[PDB]
Design a protein around this motif. Sequence first.
Motif, PDB file in Angstrom:
ATOM      1  N   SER B  68     -13.921   3.670  13.317  1.00 44.29           N
ATOM      2  CA  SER B  68     -13.580   3.655  11.835  1.00 44.29           C
ATOM      3  C   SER B  68     -14.770   3.392  11.002  1.00 44.29           C
ATOM      4  CB  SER B  68     -12.641   2.497  11.754  1.00 44.29           C
ATOM      5  OG  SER B  68     -11.519   2.677  12.249  1.00 44.29           O
ATOM      6  N   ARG B  69     -15.589   2.459  11.445  1.00 45.84           N
ATOM      7  CA  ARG B  69     -16.774   2.196  10.749  1.00 45.84           C
ATOM      8  C   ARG B  69     -17.711   3.238  10.660  1.00 45.84           C
ATOM      9  NH1 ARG B  69     -17.660  -3.082   9.301  1.00 45.84           N
ATOM     10  NH2 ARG B  69     -15.873  -4.347   9.712  1.00 45.84           N
ATOM     11  N   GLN B  70     -17.888   4.072  12.003  1.00 46.16           N
ATOM     12  CA  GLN B  70     -18.578   5.494  11.872  1.00 46.16           C
ATOM     13  C   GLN B  70     -18.209   6.307  10.922  1.00 46.16           C
ATOM     14  OE1 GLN B  70     -18.448   7.572  15.588  1.00 46.16           O
ATOM     15  NE2 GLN B  70     -19.994   9.195  14.672  1.00 46.16           N
ATOM     16  N   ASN B  71     -16.699   6.312  10.664  1.00 44.14           N
ATOM     17  CA  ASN B  71     -16.254   6.938   9.644  1.00 44.14           C
ATOM     18  C   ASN B  71     -15.950   6.374   8.367  1.00 44.14           C
ATOM     19  OD1 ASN B  71     -15.383   9.696  11.094  1.00 44.14           O
ATOM     20  ND2 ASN B  71     -14.763   8.107  12.496  1.00 44.14           N
ATOM     21  N   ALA B 106     -11.456  11.130  12.921  1.00 48.15           N
ATOM     22  CA  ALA B 106     -11.875  11.050  11.471  1.00 48.15           C
ATOM     23  C   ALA B 106     -10.700  11.526  10.469  1.00 48.15           C
ATOM     24  CB  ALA B 106     -13.348  11.902  11.254  1.00 48.15           C
ATOM     25  N   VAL B 107     -10.036  12.479  11.067  1.00 51.73           N
ATOM     26  CA  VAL B 107      -8.909  13.092  10.274  1.00 51.73           C
ATOM     27  C   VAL B 107      -7.958  11.612   9.886  1.00 51.73           C
ATOM     28  CG1 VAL B 107      -6.730  14.273  10.221  1.00 51.73           C
ATOM     29  CG2 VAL B 107      -8.657  15.265  11.292  1.00 51.73           C
ATOM     30  N   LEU B 108      -7.567  10.858  10.803  1.00 52.94           N
ATOM     31  CA  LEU B 108      -6.750   9.724  10.849  1.00 52.94           C
ATOM     32  C   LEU B 108      -7.302   8.724   9.979  1.00 52.94           C
ATOM     33  CD1 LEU B 108      -5.835   9.369  14.530  1.00 52.94           C
ATOM     34  CD2 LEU B 108      -3.987   9.954  12.702  1.00 52.94           C
ATOM     35  N   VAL B 109      -8.626   8.766   9.830  1.00 52.20           N
ATOM     36  CA  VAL B 109      -9.419   7.713   8.981  1.00 52.20           C
ATOM     37  C   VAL B 109      -9.259   8.437   7.748  1.00 52.20           C
ATOM     38  CG1 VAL B 109     -11.675   6.660   8.210  1.00 52.20           C
ATOM     39  CG2 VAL B 109     -11.114   6.966  10.736  1.00 52.20           C
ATOM     40  N   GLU B 110      -9.541   9.603   7.234  1.00 52.33           N
ATOM     41  CA  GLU B 110      -9.155  10.204   6.085  1.00 52.33           C
ATOM     42  C   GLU B 110      -8.100   9.850   5.496  1.00 52.33           C
ATOM     43  OE1 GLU B 110     -12.424  11.343   4.353  1.00 52.33           O
ATOM     44  OE2 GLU B 110     -12.825  10.078   5.878  1.00 52.33           O
ATOM     45  N   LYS B 111      -7.100  10.094   6.514  1.00 54.62           N
ATOM     46  CA  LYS B 111      -5.490   9.867   5.872  1.00 54.62           C
ATOM     47  C   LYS B 111      -5.380   8.520   5.690  1.00 54.62           C
ATOM     48  CE  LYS B 111      -2.323  12.924   7.379  1.00 54.62           C
ATOM     49  NZ  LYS B 111      -2.520  13.918   6.857  1.00 54.62           N
ATOM     50  N   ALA B 112      -5.994   7.542   6.491  1.00 55.92           N
ATOM     51  CA  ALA B 112      -5.927   5.971   5.958  1.00 55.92           C
ATOM     52  C   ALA B 112      -6.491   5.555   4.570  1.00 55.92           C
ATOM     53  CB  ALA B 112      -6.523   5.252   7.322  1.00 55.92           C
TER      54      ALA B 112
ATOM     55  N   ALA D  33     -28.231  -7.636  17.363  1.00 54.93           N
ATOM     56  CA  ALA D  33     -27.450  -8.113  18.799  1.00 54.93           C
ATOM     57  C   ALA D  33     -26.278  -7.262  18.867  1.00 54.93           C
ATOM     58  CB  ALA D  33     -27.078  -9.308  18.227  1.00 54.93           C
ATOM     59  N   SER D  34     -25.545  -6.860  17.913  1.00 56.07           N
ATOM     60  CA  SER D  34     -24.476  -5.994  18.135  1.00 56.07           C
ATOM     61  C   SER D  34     -24.768  -4.677  18.466  1.00 56.07           C
ATOM     62  CB  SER D  34     -23.715  -6.010  16.713  1.00 56.07           C
ATOM     63  OG  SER D  34     -24.372  -5.199  15.632  1.00 56.07           O
ATOM     64  N   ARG D  35     -25.961  -4.062  18.199  1.00 54.73           N
ATOM     65  CA  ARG D  35     -26.559  -2.870  18.517  1.00 54.73           C
ATOM     66  C   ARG D  35     -26.849  -2.768  19.954  1.00 54.73           C
ATOM     67  NH1 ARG D  35     -27.244   1.674  15.113  1.00 54.73           N
ATOM     68  NH2 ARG D  35     -26.504   0.985  12.853  1.00 54.73           N
ATOM     69  N   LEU D  36     -27.632  -4.085  20.440  1.00 55.60           N
ATOM     70  CA  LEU D  36     -28.142  -4.002  21.779  1.00 55.60           C
ATOM     71  C   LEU D  36     -26.701  -3.935  22.664  1.00 55.60           C
ATOM     72  CD1 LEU D  36     -30.795  -6.502  21.235  1.00 55.60           C
ATOM     73  CD2 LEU D  36     -31.197  -4.322  21.822  1.00 55.60           C
ATOM     74  N   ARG D  37     -25.638  -4.796  22.335  1.00 57.53           N
ATOM     75  CA  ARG D  37     -24.421  -4.605  23.089  1.00 57.53           C
ATOM     76  C   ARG D  37     -23.697  -3.157  22.984  1.00 57.53           C
ATOM     77  NH1 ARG D  37     -20.068  -8.289  24.977  1.00 57.53           N
ATOM     78  NH2 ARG D  37     -19.287  -9.134  22.914  1.00 57.53           N
ATOM     79  N   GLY D  38     -23.983  -2.513  21.820  1.00 54.86           N
ATOM     80  CA  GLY D  38     -23.220  -1.200  21.580  1.00 54.86           C
ATOM     81  C   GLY D  38     -21.940  -1.476  20.967  1.00 54.86           C
ATOM     82  N   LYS D  39     -21.411  -2.464  20.216  1.00 54.93           N
ATOM     83  CA  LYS D  39     -20.346  -2.632  19.479  1.00 54.93           C
ATOM     84  C   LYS D  39     -20.199  -1.488  18.628  1.00 54.93           C
ATOM     85  CE  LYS D  39     -17.964  -5.920  20.201  1.00 54.93           C
ATOM     86  NZ  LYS D  39     -18.367  -7.058  19.336  1.00 54.93           N
ATOM     87  N   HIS D  40     -21.371  -0.875  18.182  1.00 51.52           N
ATOM     88  CA  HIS D  40     -21.116  -0.105  16.924  1.00 51.52           C
ATOM     89  C   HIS D  40     -20.892   1.396  17.568  1.00 51.52           C
ATOM     90  CE1 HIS D  40     -24.970   0.784  18.942  1.00 51.52           C
ATOM     91  NE2 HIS D  40     -25.102   1.865  18.375  1.00 51.52           N
ATOM     92  N   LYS D  41     -20.387   1.383  18.751  1.00 48.06           N
ATOM     93  CA  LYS D  41     -20.006   2.354  19.464  1.00 48.06           C
ATOM     94  C   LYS D  41     -18.526   2.616  19.857  1.00 48.06           C
ATOM     95  CE  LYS D  41     -24.754   3.746  21.348  1.00 48.06           C
ATOM     96  NZ  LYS D  41     -25.364   3.956  22.745  1.00 48.06           N
ATOM     97  N   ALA D  42     -17.835   3.813  19.840  1.00 54.58           N
ATOM     98  CA  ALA D  42     -16.445   3.919  20.454  1.00 54.58           C
ATOM     99  C   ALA D  42     -16.351   3.746  22.045  1.00 54.58           C
ATOM    100  CB  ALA D  42     -15.946   5.230  19.822  1.00 54.58           C
ATOM    101  N   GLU D  43     -17.494   3.854  22.605  1.00 56.11           N
ATOM    102  CA  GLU D  43     -17.420   3.934  24.021  1.00 56.11           C
ATOM    103  C   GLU D  43     -17.979   2.400  24.663  1.00 56.11           C
ATOM    104  OE1 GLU D  43     -18.759   5.994  21.772  1.00 56.11           O
ATOM    105  OE2 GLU D  43     -19.556   7.769  22.891  1.00 56.11           O
ATOM    106  N   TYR D  44     -18.445   1.512  23.454  1.00 58.66           N
ATOM    107  CA  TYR D  44     -18.244   0.112  23.822  1.00 58.66           C
ATOM    108  C   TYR D  44     -17.328  -0.218  24.915  1.00 58.66           C
ATOM    109  CZ  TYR D  44     -17.703  -4.931  23.662  1.00 58.66           C
ATOM    110  OH  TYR D  44     -17.678  -6.065  24.197  1.00 58.66           O
TER     111      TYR D  44
END
Lengths: 103, 116, 47, 142, 78
Positions: B68-71, B106-112, D33-44
């Motif tokens: 979500s935060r990437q979007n 991203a679609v779902l995010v845009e809908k949200a 710290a969050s980036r080193l863990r990879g909390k910023h990724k969906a694959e976290y």
Amino acid sequence: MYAVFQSGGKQHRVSEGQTLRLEKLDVETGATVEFDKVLLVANGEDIKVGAPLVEGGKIVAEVVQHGRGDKVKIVKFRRRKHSRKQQGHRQWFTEVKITGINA
Amino acid sequence: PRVKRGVQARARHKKVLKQAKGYYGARSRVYRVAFQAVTKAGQYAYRDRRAKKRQFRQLWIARINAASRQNGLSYSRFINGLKKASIEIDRKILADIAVFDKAAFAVLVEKAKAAL
Amino acid sequence: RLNTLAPAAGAKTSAKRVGRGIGSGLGKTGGRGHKGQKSRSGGSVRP
Amino acid sequence: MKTFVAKPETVKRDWYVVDAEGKTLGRLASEIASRLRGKHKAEYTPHVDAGDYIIVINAEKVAVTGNKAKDKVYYRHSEFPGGLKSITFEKLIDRKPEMVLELAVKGMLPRGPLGRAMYRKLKVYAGAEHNHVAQQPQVLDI
Amino acid sequence: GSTRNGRDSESKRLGVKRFGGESVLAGNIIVRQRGTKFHAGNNVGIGKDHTLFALTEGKVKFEVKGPKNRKFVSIEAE
RNA sequence: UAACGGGGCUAAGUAGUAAACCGAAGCUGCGGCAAUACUAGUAUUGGGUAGGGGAGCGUUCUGUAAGCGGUUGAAGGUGU
RNA sequence: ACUCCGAAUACCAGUAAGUACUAUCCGGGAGACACACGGCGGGUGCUAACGUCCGUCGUGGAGAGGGAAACAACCCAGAC
RNA sequence: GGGGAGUGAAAUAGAACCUGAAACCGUGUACGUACAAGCAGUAGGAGCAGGCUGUCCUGUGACUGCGUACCUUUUGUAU
């Protein structure tokens, strides 16, 4: 192409030709089952989102097998209080193979 | 009549010992330690069958928040958005989508976003 | 017919066997409670 | 069926370069710290280091609010009797610039094997330069 | 290093045994008291220990009456 | 260190306003089992020590049984 | 350990609705009669004590789960 | 003391002799393990190795979360 449907009390992202185990359904083996409650269909970039349900959403599947899952042992043990209890569990499932996904 | 306990006594001991395969030391060899071990394994297994449901949901929420935060939307705002949009996709699916179909997420995010 | 005879339902009842584990519900203390005269062997109190 | 798991083999870790100059130590550290863990990724995946290599430059220019410059104390015990050593933020910035940020990040990372692994991916530098041009780090405003 | 005290009598379970409006049979003790904290009114006897009891069936009624404004227990015909 | 759990924080403190979300074995959903009522379905119920109550498993021995299985392999042992 | 006065509550009784297998009685079987902390009212103590003795309610005991860093007895909440 | 040979239906029936459990001790093989902190598991989970043919089975188990044995006695025990 995949779709998301609700069966059991759960949701299932599924694609055509996917076998998957669900909570037991009241259906015979070999039967066709059509799941009405579809939440999302996706064919490539085209994404139908239900609100809640996609309008003409239908996942058809064949009932492969009704079965019992591998046993779980329930152990209850209250230390120093002379109380212990055991209990087996095998959860029933229905295996379904997805035949078709109607958007 | 006199009953000898051997044959059945062994069967009980063996059952436990077989459940304790793989434990360190006494815990796989010695009945007195193994029994205690197999009991605590059952206790943990009960507690963890519950806590599995918590751990997995935390994982999904963490992943959905990432996506979500990437979007450009917080997890908290995204769930509200979806609720307001009447989208009832579970966290387990959302998190699956966030990994496997980034575009749909991203679609779902845009809908949200529109619902907020 | 000697293999076919059976008592009436209710006629026979398994006796109580104290001190055979937790599941029986008569393990350990055998329904005597914890300590005191009445829990002791030969520990009855004269009516 | 099963939730996806990041695979130590497959996980893509990107190099980034962060300038610490004028950044609140703690606020900077929490992001790193969050980036080193990879909390910023969906694959976290909690049991996998799917985080990102972070280079920090101008670590000696990291900022702190209040009278923390003169009052923030770093402790170390040698394990000899009466072996407690104190240094203030200002003095540690003189002696070992980089330690200040590294310590900050270390605290914010999980304890144990994986968390030690994550910290390995932090490459802090006091100057404006770094030796990891070959890794082609992207600038990151954190 | 001791107490000259220690002593007390057994509580004598005094008090109103049947309150206003209660249906009583003849004989029923209503009040147990020391002296006439309550006086006997109509259909109420008084024992040697000043126990008020119902002389007739009916309903207990308390009432302030008279020039001294004394409380009276009576049984009302009902 | 050692009187924020730590990092660290000048808001990541305190007071407040708005709208969110997280969060339990609580509630709900889905599947299953049981107790007790009712009329197989409903409805309620199923933490538990001392303790009460109920229902079983397995062991040795007797009958059933000079039957039934067994050197074309019993019991026991050890795996699956 | 005074009262010209005087509550809230509580208790006793009656009337009445709705909800609830409640109350009561007679038998068989017990166990228990070392309690703990917390709130509230108090005595004692120093309106000290994880003190002590009562009243009353809660929890623990005999209760898991979430919170309170960790923490029977606190907060939330009762695990087929 | 053993290995052959021979005997025997059988010799891991060889006299330290029917069966031959467990503790305990070995050899071999697979996997893990020398930067890592605690009731040793549990829920999850990569990799590797065997099968069978990779939304399988088996073994091992890097890494992550959670997690102070049992009994007894107690108001109350990781104690």
